[PDB]
Amino acid sequence: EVFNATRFASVYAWNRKRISNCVADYSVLYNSASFSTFKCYGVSPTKL
Amino acid sequence: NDLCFTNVYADSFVIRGDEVRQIAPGQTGKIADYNYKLPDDFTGCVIA
């Protein structure tokens, strides 16, 4: 819902979605999607 | 120019445009976890 997002919010009125009660499998994300800037602040991508 | 090196090695691979950032110490993805990982105390330069 976050990543493929067919109707996707504008920048002047952006959308905030709460995520709860699940597991964050990062390996699924880059199977079919390529991210240009995966900048991470405060938390290293290795220890995510 | 003023240095003289002892043990040099030239890695060689083709990656897509989004994954050039992944060839760096500490970055993750499907190119820096499953294909080619650079050491944390790396000393050299990546030319793409």
Distance from CA of B2 to the nearest CA of A (A): 35
Contact B27 A45 (CB under 8 A): yes
Per the entry, the structure determination technique was cryo-EM
Cβ–Cβ pairs < 8 A, chains A and B: 17
Resolution for the entry shown, Å: 2.8
Contact B18 A36 (CB under 8 A): yes
Going by C-alpha positions, the residue among B35, B13, B15, B37 that lies closest to residue B24 is B37
Sign of CA dihedral B10, B15, B21, B24: negative
Measure the CA–CA gap between B30 and A34, rounded to whole angstroms: 10
Q: How far is CA B37 from the centre of its chain?
A: 7
Residue with tokens 């043990």: B7
Measure the CA–CA gap between B7 and A7, rounded to whole angstroms: 54
Measure the CA–CA gap between A13 and A46, rounded to whole angstroms: 32
Measure the CA–CA gap between B34 and B41, rounded to whole angstroms: 19
Residue A7 structure tokens: 């109707």
Query: Which residues in chain B are closer than 8 Å to A40, comparing Cβ atoms?
Result: none
Burial of B18 per CB tally in 10 Å (0-12, 13-18, 19+): middle
